[PDB]
Amino acid sequence: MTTTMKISIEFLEPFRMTKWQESTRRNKNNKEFVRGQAFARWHRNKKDNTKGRPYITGTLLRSAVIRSAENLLTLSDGKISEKTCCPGKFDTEDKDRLLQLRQRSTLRWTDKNPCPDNAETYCPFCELLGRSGNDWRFRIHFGNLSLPGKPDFDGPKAIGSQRVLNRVDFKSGKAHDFFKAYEVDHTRFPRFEGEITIDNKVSAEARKLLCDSLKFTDRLCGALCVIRFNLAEKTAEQIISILDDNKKTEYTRLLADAIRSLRRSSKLVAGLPKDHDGKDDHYLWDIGKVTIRQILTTSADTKELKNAGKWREFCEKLGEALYLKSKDMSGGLKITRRILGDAEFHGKPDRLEKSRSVSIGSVLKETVVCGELVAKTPFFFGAIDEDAKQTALQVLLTPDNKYRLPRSAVRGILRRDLQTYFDSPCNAELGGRPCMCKTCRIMRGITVMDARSEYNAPPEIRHRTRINPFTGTVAEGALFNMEVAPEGIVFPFQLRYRGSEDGLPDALKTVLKWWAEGQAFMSGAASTGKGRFRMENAKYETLDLSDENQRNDYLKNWGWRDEKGLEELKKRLNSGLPEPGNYRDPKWHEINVSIEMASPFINGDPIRAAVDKRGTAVVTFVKYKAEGEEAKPVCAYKAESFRGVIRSAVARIHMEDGVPLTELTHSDCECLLCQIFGSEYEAGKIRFEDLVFESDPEPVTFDHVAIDRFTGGAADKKKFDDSPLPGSPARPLMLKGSFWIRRDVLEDEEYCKALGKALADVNNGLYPLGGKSAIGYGQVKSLGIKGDDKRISRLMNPAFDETDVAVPEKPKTDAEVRIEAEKVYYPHYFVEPHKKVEREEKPCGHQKFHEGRLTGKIRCKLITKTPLIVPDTSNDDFFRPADKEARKEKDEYHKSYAFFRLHKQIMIPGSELRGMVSSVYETVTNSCFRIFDETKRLSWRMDADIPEKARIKYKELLRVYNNNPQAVDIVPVRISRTVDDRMIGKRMSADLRPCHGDWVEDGDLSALNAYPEKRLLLRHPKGLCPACRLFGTGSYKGRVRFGFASLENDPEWLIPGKNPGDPFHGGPVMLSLLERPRPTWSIPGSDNKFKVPGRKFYVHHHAWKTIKDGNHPTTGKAIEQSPNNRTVEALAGGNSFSFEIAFENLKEWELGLLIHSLQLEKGLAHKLGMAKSMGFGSVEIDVESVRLRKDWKQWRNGNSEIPNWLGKGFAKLKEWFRDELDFIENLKKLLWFPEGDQAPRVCYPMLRKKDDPNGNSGYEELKDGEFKKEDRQKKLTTPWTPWA
Amino acid sequence: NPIRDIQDRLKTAKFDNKDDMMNLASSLYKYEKQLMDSSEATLCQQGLSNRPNSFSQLSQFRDSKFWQNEYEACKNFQTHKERRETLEQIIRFLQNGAEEKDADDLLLKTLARAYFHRGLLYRPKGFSVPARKVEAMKKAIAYCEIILDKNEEESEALRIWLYAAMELRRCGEEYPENFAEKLFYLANDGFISELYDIRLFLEYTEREEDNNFLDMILQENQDRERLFELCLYKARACFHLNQLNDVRIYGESAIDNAPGAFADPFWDELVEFIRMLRNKKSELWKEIAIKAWDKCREKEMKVGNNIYLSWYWARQRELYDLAFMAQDGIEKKTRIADSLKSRTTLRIQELNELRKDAHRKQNRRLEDKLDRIIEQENEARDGAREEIPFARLPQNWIAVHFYLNELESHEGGKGGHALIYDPQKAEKDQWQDKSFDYKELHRKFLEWQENYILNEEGSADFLVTLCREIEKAMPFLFKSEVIPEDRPVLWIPHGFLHRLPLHAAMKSGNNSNIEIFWERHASRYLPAWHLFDPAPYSREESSTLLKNFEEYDFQNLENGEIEVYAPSSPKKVKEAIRENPAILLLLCHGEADMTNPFRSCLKLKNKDMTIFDLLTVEDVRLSGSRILLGACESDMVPPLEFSVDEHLSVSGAFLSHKAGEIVAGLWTVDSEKVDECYSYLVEEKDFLRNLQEWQMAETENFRSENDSSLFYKIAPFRIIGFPA
RNA sequence: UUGAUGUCACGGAACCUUUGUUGUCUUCGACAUGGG
Ligand SMILES: [Zn+2]
Ligand SMILES: [Zn+2]
Ligand SMILES: [Zn+2]
Ligand SMILES: [Zn+2]
């Protein structure tokens, strides 16, 4: 007869479960089955279907109970209720019928032989083993444990999620194999229930030993335990159909990522950016004339998606759908994942292992440590879900979306840090008797708790790219993305150590001290700063389980494992960690970085630019910081980008047997980069965190516009605003942060030299930070380093200079112009180019500083010869009086601008100066027209005295009729428009068109937009002309950088200003109508002989005097306020600016013609800024010094070499054009500045003779003489030809 | 370069010819691949001429690759790193397409070869096979089975499938299913396409005795690059025909020409050939095993006169076991056993660690790490010391040589052997071969070792029990007919026997009369017989004590006629061994490195000193110096893993510098009795007798109550070396 | 839905490797219209 005991297990952590196996494979030869015996099992309800439920075997519970009983007997010296136990018996014949054999050593408490195998009076431990009693009858029986009520589920994936578990090589830092298990969350499935049944002859002492062993058992199935006695699918295909119908599926990827970004809040849908001028015509969201904007805003108002959890799920699914569609729009040439990431390896136990017995003794104590782990940087515990594929790298979350800090990762980093303390790796073999080394014995005592955050907002996405070292652009198809958890999250931390020494081992005291000091590097992606924690609020206590009174109190309370017990235990933990005896310094040093930038800064984020209300086309990266439940944004400079900059600075200046390190593949590689920065075969030894700005700056918008080289007007390019952080000489941006460097690197002088040289060149300003360095952003003024003990910064002393020779005098010009005071000239003329354009197929590569080529800086002063306008277009209502409060109703109004200022400092953007100098350099070298509206189609009025060709011409006619600003072959009306058969690109010589241009032939090139060789139809057969080689293209980074210009003196204004007490603001001048250029004037007709004339330049003259008097230049009547005029704040002549140009890998003839284009000659000047034709904008530039990089440590003065460079530039021009060099003298004759008594008028004609009180001809009369269609191009291409 | 090619394929191409179509398609593919790879070709900045015509023909082409990737990696005039890169590119370009709904055969067949060949190239990482390799072979099989499902006798897919299956067998996996069926189809295919196939027809012959193919194997032409393998295959074919004289001739010809690198599969196939002849109970295996052993003696000397290094090979131990069993002469058995001793075996991971340290010291042993040529020997697929006479032992001694034969043990026999040499007997009676079973002795050692690691002196009872197992396993140690009564014994152990106190073996006897071995004979130890090189002692008065051991004050050593340094640094250690002291005492801690013995180190005051550092010291003058060691010698040795493990330690480093004789402990020694013991030996510098006097003095205290705790303190000390 | 004299699986960090970069002057004068 028997009696029964009810049992239940309560799990405190996610427990592990093994895969189902067919009944034949459930045998000792199947490695996957044997390795899973310690886990929970899945019961298929019926063989051929996954429907089932989990369960735990009683055989597993018995094995744990026996292990507990051995431990309790050794503490009590083998006596239970003052009755004695023998060692037990653990060996059988016919070992082959056992599925598993004991690897571990059995404990001993006595030396006596065990009971005979056919006796009657067995001791209590032999009753628990079932040798007492020994169809089959059980003396104590353990049943299986099941979920209460035996519910069923359709499969394991309903219960839990399968997860990859690593094994990392200590020496390499890389994992070479892994295994998998299902993790089942305890909050969903806390309890399992079962029963134990006992025969009535079992002794009372055996019953006590059983109950104590159950209470002492603290783990099962890999978890700590206590034992007690649809819309997203519809919306996707809807959007896909809309995006296809409108023929804009090139944006599917961007839409997918931008919509997925809306997980953060439904309130973002109301804030999506609008078009310029503020209309709902944005190029993404207003596709569909319903718009995607309407589809999302109606999804947002839907009650089924008003719950934040359901909005998140909606966005995730819709993003996945759009992404899975988006791939088909491209060739799909490669799989992006890399090779054999599939090596599942299961440890094999050794059947042949030898039996052993060990004493351990009665001394046994348990130390509890409690605290928190606080994320000091973003962190990444990688867990990919194969059912989600939009993100390449994904982070581990609980089923209810709280962030998780796994048990498995905490153990893995303890074992790593213990091997670091002892400075001795383990060969971490699987199987066989336990490893007896000093680290493994500590880990065998340790216990840690799986933990989760309370914070549960969705992760951030960070995008990453790869740079093509030769071209300086992104590599083809290199974009990839990653999820990260925010910094500031707090996890509960609890560790327990059970062992024989008093308190913790000294190695563990030290490792916990490293964690408390802030060096708990715990997550993946460490090389880019992820996963650094500090252990905080630590408290500890030791329990003496050898004491019978404390042991029984420990058993009574289940060791205070559950939450009720734990709060009672935390009342009597001592504060602070114990100090170690043999303290050892940690393996990583913190190096502190300080960077100063006197220029704007941008580190772009395209997805944010799409979602953000601000609407500018490029915006800075911002990162979110968790504090409590809130997430707050911060502007930062990414760890990834900063790592990339420093890595390339080292790479470009080192070699591996004559090959630059930028040119290697770095696979199976052991070079200097791989030794420091790591490889795909080993971890790196330097870790970069994010840098952040102090004083909390705010973005500012800058607008830009491309200028057509023919017409001089805007080129209607795709809008390209940016929103950098503002910095200037009076208000530098201060970047601060740290990177961590391993101790064995600082101890190596060969690595300190490599880093020292690279950081020296960053400090020299050769490596700007972020984007748009071409126009003056990201200029580093200094880089400071602390914490190296001067082992790195000893190489970073400033290079200073070599010599103090002065710059030569610029030559006097030989240009001449015969002005006649009675005559009138035209405001602009065209330079007609030479027929030959010198092109090269393969430019200079960016991957190293080439020998025989120059790298350095030019410093310049700019001086105004004529009043200058450079407007601050951020506010076009500047001069409205304050008393006219808040007049704004979408009326239209007279616009008014201030001069450009940044932090209240008067400046000129570098984008202006680059374009101004580029235009002259393009002309001096006879380059192509870099900017040109080659797909424009001209038209003319008819004189009063079907093929798809006819359709495109007619629809051109229809639009020009509709969009006429002056309104009150197939033709709809008897006298009408004539539309050109050809694009305007066909009216220009094919060698003068842009090297990388638009498609201008017949047939739609969009047929090929999925295939990569399309780009070859758009490129010239012979390569890049000189200007595109120097200033660059969208496929090739340029070699010159232009900085902002700063005013030197206190301002001198054109008009004295409204407040006499303030010298820093000027008064308004009101301008005449600035109006569109007209190519129909200079290309007079449809005839093929009318080709494009040349490059427009505006002449120098003093009509600005008439305008400050308030009179119109042509007809001297007063200028009148209207919504078509502008008012502006203008600087006077005599103001002086300074600015700097950086250059890299130039030839001597390139630098010669660049200095020539800046400097020109005495008697010549440039045109800068607004209102050129009205006289404004004349400036002169003088070179102040040239400084050259010899190497990383030596810079030298280049002033003495300028005469040589100029000579070689002119020699190059003679080599190309062989004195057929007229286009230069025509240029210089338009750059000529009038001298002394000379005063050309200069102005446009009036529309009619009688409209002009001066009586000059006017256009209607001028077209009938001296500017007839046959003569007009010759007039306009001859500088200073008079029209009256 | 590539853009110009595309232009040519458009000047001359019409698509009613498939050669024009193919040559155009190839040019576009090679263009677009290196656009992804970011080569220098990305600086080619030009475009296509004749824009409207080029647009027309390209759009026609797209309105209307395995052929390329087949061609790459046919070139193999390049290193193993370069082979690895090209194979991986083939995989990551073709893996994307082979998973299509119905992929082409040549796409599948090319990718299968890339996975197979890439699998061969994986560098080992431990005692197990790398998991990446086994996965790669299973991937290769998977793609072949797509081709073989649609065509049951595609010869190339069949041969790739079989090649991968054989490698799985080499890795220790089981054969796949249908292995016999696929091998039968190969026997129906019926011809040797490459020499790499002949092993399949031999597998078929062995499984089915269908001898028809053996004539082809013998008839094959000899003008081949890897003839040593061909002779082994001819030898196997010639065995199945029962032509045993030519089996002998081909077998010896194969071994004589054998490759120098164990990574070549020849060495594994040779051992299986020997083991196959044995299990068929031929007599040829004995001769071939002995010849193979004689060839396997290939090694490196490190600095230090007596220390050697070798690369790891998994079946070397099996070959030496076979050669030992083949040889009948006891004197020649000893030379086989002696060949294993005092030699480290490292993997290509740790060989690189030594290469770095040699570089750090700017030492030309760095060039001896051309042994990493072994990495370029993985692929057969391409088809690419003085012997010390035993007569030098002085006649008043006895020498005992141990060998532990694991194969003979696991086959159930008595695999432990003690080869005893007596120099006084007639020339045919000098050698005895006494055999014993060490399984229970090994278990009792591991049982002591764990109790020692957890409790130190608490393990004394397990030590006492272990010392009785030495006698129970070796009763002949207490027989006068094997070890005559008075003569000193020289021990040359093997494996875990190095860890045992052989000099302290206990005979139980009558319950009142326990007897210990050191009461009968004096003892000395040598790691191996080839270290035997006697010399006189140093002719100096200097005695030096180097200490970094703050736990204790050696009041009897430090207050005497000694040059005492209480703290010490590696520079002082280096300096002292350049003065050739009469006696040198070194009392400090040390730590082991389980993975790489040479990186085990001594703990000096501010800087650790490795075994590598100690061996490589320049200008050392230490010949004939007597040396005594503290805890470092015991602590620089890891816990044992296998019965035949042997681990280098500081005692072996000093002996490489020709030190006279060395006193050290087998386990951690009590400082208070180090203080007494070493003082006595310093005062009376005849170590061999004075250590026995000390042990026989203390054994009187042991006999009073048989305290194991006292036996634990006096047993560990032993003498290593053999001076004149 | 376990099988019993033998389960160190708290025996195993999803780890390692990749600059959102590149190219663009916030510029500016000749018409409009259909008849007869
Ligand atoms: Zn019992
Ligand atoms: Zn270990
Ligand atoms: Zn490298
Ligand atoms: Zn160009």
Residue numbers in the entry:
A (entry chain A): 1 to 134, 143 to 237, 260 to 319, 327 to 982, 1230 to 1252, 1286 to 1601
B (entry chain B): 3 to 66, 78 to 397, 411 to 750
Wording from the paper:
Here, we determine the protein substrate, structure, and mechanism of a type III-E CRISPR-associated protease (CASP) from the marine anaerobe Desulfonema ishimotonii, reveal insight into its natural function in coordinating a transcriptional response to foreign genetic material, and engineer it for novel RNA sensing applications in vitro and in human cells. We identified that the largest protein, Csx30, is specifically cleaved in response to a target RNA. Csx29 consists of a three-helix bundle N-terminal domain (NTD), a TPR domain with eight repeats, and a protease region containing a pseudo-caspase (CHAT1) and active-caspase (CHAT2) domain that resembles separases. In both complexes, Cas7.2-Cas7.4 interface with the NTD, TPR and CHAT1 domains of Csx29.
By comparing the inactive and active complexes we observed a major structural change within the eighth repeat of the TPR domain, which we term the activation region (AR). The AR is bipartite, composed of AR1 (aa 313–325) and AR2 (aa 356–411), which stack with each other in the inactive state. For the inactive complex, 877,928 particles were extracted from 16,553 micrographs, and downscaled twofold. After cleaning poor quality particles by 3D classification (4 classes, tau_fudge = 4, 30 Å resolution reference, 25 iterations), remaining particles were subject to CTF refinement and Bayesian polishing, and one more round of 3D classification (4 classes, tau_fudge = 4, 15 Å resolution reference, 25 iterations, soft mask with 3 pixel hard edge, 8 pixel soft edge), and refinement, producing a reconstruction from 374,026 particles at 3.2-Å resolution. Since the peripheral regions of the complex, as well as Csx29 NTD, and the NTD-proximal parts within the TPR domain were flexible, focused refinement was performed to improve the EM density in those regions. After removing these particles, the remaining particles were focus-refined by performing local angular searches starting at 0.9 degree sampling, and using the classification mask, producing a reconstruction at 3.2-Å resolution.
